[PDB]
Amino acid sequence: NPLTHSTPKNFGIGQAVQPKRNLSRYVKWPEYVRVQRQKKILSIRLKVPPTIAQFQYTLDRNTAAETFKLFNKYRPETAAEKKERLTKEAAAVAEGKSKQDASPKPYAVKYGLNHVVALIENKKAKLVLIANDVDPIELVVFLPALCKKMGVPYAIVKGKARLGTLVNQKTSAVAALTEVRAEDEAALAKLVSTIDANFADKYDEVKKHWGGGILGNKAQAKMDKRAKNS
Amino acid sequence: GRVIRNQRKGAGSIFTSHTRLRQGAAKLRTLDYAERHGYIRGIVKQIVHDSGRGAPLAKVVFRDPYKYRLREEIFIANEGVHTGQFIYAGKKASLNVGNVLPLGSVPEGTIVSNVEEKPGDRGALARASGNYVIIIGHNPDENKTRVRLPSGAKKVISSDARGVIGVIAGGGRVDKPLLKAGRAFHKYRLKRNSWPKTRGVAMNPVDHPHGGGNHQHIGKASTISRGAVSGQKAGLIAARRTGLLRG
Amino acid sequence: YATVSKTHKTVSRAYGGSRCANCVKERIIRAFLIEEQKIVKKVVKEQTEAAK
RNA sequence: UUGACAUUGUGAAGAGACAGUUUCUUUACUUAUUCAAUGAAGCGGAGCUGGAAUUCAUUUUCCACGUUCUAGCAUUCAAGGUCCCAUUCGGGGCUGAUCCGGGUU
RNA sequence: ACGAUCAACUU
RNA sequence: GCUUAUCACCCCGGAAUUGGUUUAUCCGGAGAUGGGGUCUUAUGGCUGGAAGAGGCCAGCACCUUUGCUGGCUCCGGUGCGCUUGUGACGGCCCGUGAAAAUCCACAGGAAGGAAUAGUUUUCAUGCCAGGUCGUACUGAUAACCGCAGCAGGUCUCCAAGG
RNA sequence: GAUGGGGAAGCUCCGUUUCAAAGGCCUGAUUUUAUGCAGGCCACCAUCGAAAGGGAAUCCGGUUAAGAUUCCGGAACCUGG
Ligand SMILES: [Mg+2]
Ligand SMILES: [Mg+2]
Ligand SMILES: [Mg+2]
Ligand SMILES: [Mg+2]
Ligand SMILES: [Mg+2]
Ligand SMILES: [Mg+2]
Ligand SMILES: [Mg+2]
Ligand SMILES: [Mg+2]
Ligand SMILES: [Mg+2]
């Protein structure tokens, strides 16, 4: 086209007002955003005692996916199924009455912090999943040590929300299997082996390693520059 | 037994500065990317008198780099700066009177004014009429610059601190005797309520440490220590010496 | 000024009722001459960048 | 105003006296704390492009990064170049305007 | 080279 | 409504034998003097408003709501005059002597717009409405304060002749 | 002088844009009716503060016992629509 021309602007200093660029790096965020970012920064800047930072060693994606595939076969009955179970029990009480247990024994994921800790202490739990993002962390920080003491396999897994949706809650912070069906015992044993290879078998070595002490991008670059010459 | 005048000044009721007619705070541009990496050109529109200030003020227009508009800046005018002159401010700006440069970008012996104490404070040193800072040395190892201040003091400043080439305009102002009370009156009615001054020895003891007596006399040493408290610091505070210098 | 027609408020020229017709002439001459000088400046720069 | 304890953490050196302890140097780190500014706009690292390598294409390299006779002007997600669509008085992506880290400095 | 008209209040 | 200006500006022209010029000495090759023009409308003039009003008189009627009828209301001069407004200047400052609401103009070019009503109209005329609160009087040798109808005190505008 | 925020046992004090996620313009509008997604627009921070400062627009004649640039008569002007 002979009627169109190449203008090009000169966005150098002192000429041609700057075009709109991405300023997402310089946004003055609201205080709550700033504090929730800086808290994570401070957590990793400080030296983390081994009792913390035993967490952020979470079960990897594949083993976690298979673990939840197993745990999803033992979801506790929701209100809809419990209501009809109670109707069946009412009918059985009306006529049948074997003793009182016409309904079969349930196999369900155990959840609830106090209930799970009691199951660990009684050594009934065969596999314990601990959420990695519990705030305050004191609620579960003793759990890996307690499981090691009781000889109960445990895994630190990502997501109290994921545990919650497993047990029909918003958040669960812990989940446990104390009994599985016969067709799932071998899968449970395979999981126990893999989980122990990552958490229980490495527990004594992890317990002596301090986390944190990590620098930011600019300080890391500056220390690399200093170390290159000094 | 009464709160004395120098104590009363700090409450700042009748002792605040008279700022109605002032043109605005005189300061350099906000130190931005353009001044930090290159230079930016401004235009001197006006050289205006400022109430209560001996030195005149230059009013300089810069283009906004990020939005389409003009930004006014109130500089303190240096000697020789004229209306319609182009001012260049930045690291790569030239060594000409009126230009704003980092102290690390000028040779030793350069005469600058409105010098920042820290980079980005927009000017703190050598602001009164006829005053200037002399650049006397550089320490590129620590990114520092030695300067001589108007008081004769030697100072070390960041080499990123900016200054304006030249000397503040209006020099020689204090070389003219006022000759009369009314000229001091008009001088201070544009500044603050500090004039006239009553001598402490002309007061009663209730009003001043120097008050009282059957003759006017201070009666005790007028050299007051640093550790004296408010109401005691009247006279020559922490004086290393007194009397006429060289006999 | 909100009551009278546009004729009372401007002059039939660029910058009609804001500049004084000598400043407009000066603006025109300065714009033309500086633009031509910019062309000369970049031609000189392109010439002196061919020395090597 | 001066000292002590608390806020108060992390590396080293190394005066040492001596499995360790204990005062004592000196300097280092940044996240606590403190100062300042901005409409938190261009920070840090790397790369591209230029010139001196007495380079091994092998950055054991440094400096630069579109504006300097003139009281003009500089804004419409930018023209251009490229792709996509049932395109009309068009709409969209990339590039123009290097990449990466979201630490505003 | 003056003539004609009009008009104040200073010395 | 028409017209009317110091200043400012424009066109022609090219100035030493320097000229123009203020009470006050500034201005001119960065273009004077001169010739011709442009503009602000402070202000004045004429016209409309408006003689129908207002003023001054003369004749009749008269408390019959109380009048009626007619005439004239014009043309000049003067100024270191007074008061006041304003203009162009000049002196003074180490003093250079408010702010905001508000209105307008320009730059820019986003959109929109063409033939028996196709856009827009800062041009003329035409239509409707403009709420609330204050508004009397004194303002002082008697309306305020001073124990009072107190020789005190209490901000300001207009200002005839000798 | 509120607000955000900080101080104070507290009555309250500081501060007036601050270390805050602090808002309203045009245009698409089927006008039973108010909206639906659009894309930026400064970042100005409440409010109070003058019957002599700033400021939209009215004059003349007449009229009352006592009101008038307000009433009557005539003649204008501004603002909003
Ligand atoms: Mg004295
Ligand atoms: Mg005395
Ligand atoms: Mg004493
Ligand atoms: Mg009245
Ligand atoms: Mg009255
Ligand atoms: Mg009255
Ligand atoms: Mg008000
Ligand atoms: Mg009256
Ligand atoms: Mg009327």
Swiss-Prot record, chain A:
Compartments reported by the entry: Cytoplasm
Keywords: Cytoplasm, Ribonucleoprotein, Ribosomal protein
Main location: cytoplasm
GO terms, molecular function: RNA binding; structural constituent of ribosome
Name of one Pfam family that matches: Ribosomal_L7Ae
Keyword Cytoplasm: yes
InterPro entries found in the cross-reference section: eL8/uL1-like (IPR050257), Ribosomal_eL30-like_sf (IPR029064), Ribosomal_eL8-like_CS (IPR004037), Ribosomal_eL8/eL30/eS12/Gad45 (IPR004038), Ribosomal_eL8/Nhp2 (IPR018492), Ribosomal_eL8_euk (IPR001921)
One GO term (biological process): maturation of LSU-rRNA
Cellular component GO terms held in the UniProt record: cytosol; cytosolic large ribosomal subunit
Function: Component of the ribosome, a large ribonucleoprotein complex responsible for the synthesis of proteins in the cell. The small ribosomal subunit (SSU) binds messenger RNAs (mRNAs) and translates the encoded message by selecting cognate aminoacyl-transfer RNA (tRNA) molecules. The large subunit (LSU) contains the ribosomal catalytic site termed the peptidyl transferase center (PTC), which catalyzes the formation of peptide bonds, thereby polymerizing the amino acids delivered by tRNAs into a polypeptide chain.
Further remarks about this protein from its record: Present with 238000 molecules/cell in log phase SD medium.
Recorded family membership: Belongs to the eukaryotic ribosomal protein eL8 family.
Subunit structure: Component of the large ribosomal subunit (LSU). Mature yeast ribosomes consist of a small (40S) and a large (60S) subunit. The 40S small subunit contains 1 molecule of ribosomal RNA (18S rRNA) and 33 different proteins (encoded by 57 genes). The large 60S subunit contains 3 rRNA molecules (25S, 5.8S and 5S rRNA) and 46 different proteins (encoded by 81 genes).
Protein name: Large ribosomal subunit protein eL8A
Taxonomic source organism: Saccharomyces cerevisiae (strain ATCC 204508 / S288c)
Encoding gene (name): RPL8A
From Swiss-Prot, chain B:
InterPro entries tied to this protein: NA-bd_OB-fold (IPR012340), Rib_uL2_dom2 (IPR014722), Ribosomal_uL2 (IPR002171), Ribosomal_uL2_C (IPR022669), Ribosomal_uL2_CS (IPR022671), Ribosomal_uL2_dom3 (IPR014726), Ribosomal_uL2_RNA-bd_dom (IPR022666), Translation_prot_SH3-like_sf (IPR008991)
GO terms for MF: RNA binding; rRNA binding; structural constituent of ribosome
Pfam families from the UniProt entry: Ribosomal_L2 (PF00181), Ribosomal_L2_C (PF03947)
Task performed by this protein: Component of the ribosome, a large ribonucleoprotein complex responsible for the synthesis of proteins in the cell. The small ribosomal subunit (SSU) binds messenger RNAs (mRNAs) and translates the encoded message by selecting cognate aminoacyl-transfer RNA (tRNA) molecules. The large subunit (LSU) contains the ribosomal catalytic site termed the peptidyl transferase center (PTC), which catalyzes the formation of peptide bonds, thereby polymerizing the amino acids delivered by tRNAs into a polypeptide chain.
Any one of the GO BP annotations: ribosomal large subunit biogenesis
Entry coiled-coil feature ranges: none
Subcellular location: Cytoplasm
Keywords from the named record: Cytoplasm, Isopeptide bond, Phosphoprotein, Ribonucleoprotein, Ribosomal protein, RNA-binding, rRNA-binding, Ubl conjugation
Modification Phosphoserine, positions: S51, S94, S158, S159
Gene behind the chain: RPL2A
A GO CC annotation given for this chain: cytosolic large ribosomal subunit
Protein name: Large ribosomal subunit protein uL2A
Gene3D superfamilies membership: 2.30.30.30, Nucleic acid-binding proteins (2.40.50.140), Ribosomal protein L2, domain 3 (4.10.950.10)
Residue(s) of cross-link: Glycyl lysine isopeptide (Lys-Gly) (interchain with G-Cter in ubiquitin): K45, K92, K118, K144
Note: There are 2 genes for uL2 in yeast.
Protein family membership: Belongs to the universal ribosomal protein uL2 family.
Swiss-Prot record, chain C:
Described purpose of this protein according to its UniProt entry: Component of the ribosome, a large ribonucleoprotein complex responsible for the synthesis of proteins in the cell. The small ribosomal subunit (SSU) binds messenger RNAs (mRNAs) and translates the encoded message by selecting cognate aminoacyl-transfer RNA (tRNA) molecules. The large subunit (LSU) contains the ribosomal catalytic site termed the peptidyl transferase center (PTC), which catalyzes the formation of peptide bonds, thereby polymerizing the amino acids delivered by tRNAs into a polypeptide chain.
Oligomeric form and interacting partners: Component of the large ribosomal subunit (LSU). Mature yeast ribosomes consist of a small (40S) and a large (60S) subunit. The 40S small subunit contains 1 molecule of ribosomal RNA (18S rRNA) and 33 different proteins (encoded by 57 genes). The large 60S subunit contains 3 rRNA molecules (25S, 5.8S and 5S rRNA) and 46 different proteins (encoded by 81 genes).
Compartment(s) of residence: Cytoplasm
Keyword terms, alphabetized: Cytoplasm, Ribonucleoprotein, Ribosomal protein
Protein name: Large ribosomal subunit protein eL34A
UniProt main location, coarse: cytoplasm
BP GO terms, sorted: cytoplasmic translation; ribosome biogenesis
Keyword Nucleotide-binding among UniProt keywords: no
Membership in a protein family: Belongs to the eukaryotic ribosomal protein eL34 family.
Part of the full-length chain shown: 62 to 113 of 121
GO cellular component, one term: cytosol
UniProt keyword Disulfide bond, yes or no: no
Remarks, miscellaneous: Present with 23600 molecules/cell in log phase SD medium.
GO molecular function, one term: structural constituent of ribosome
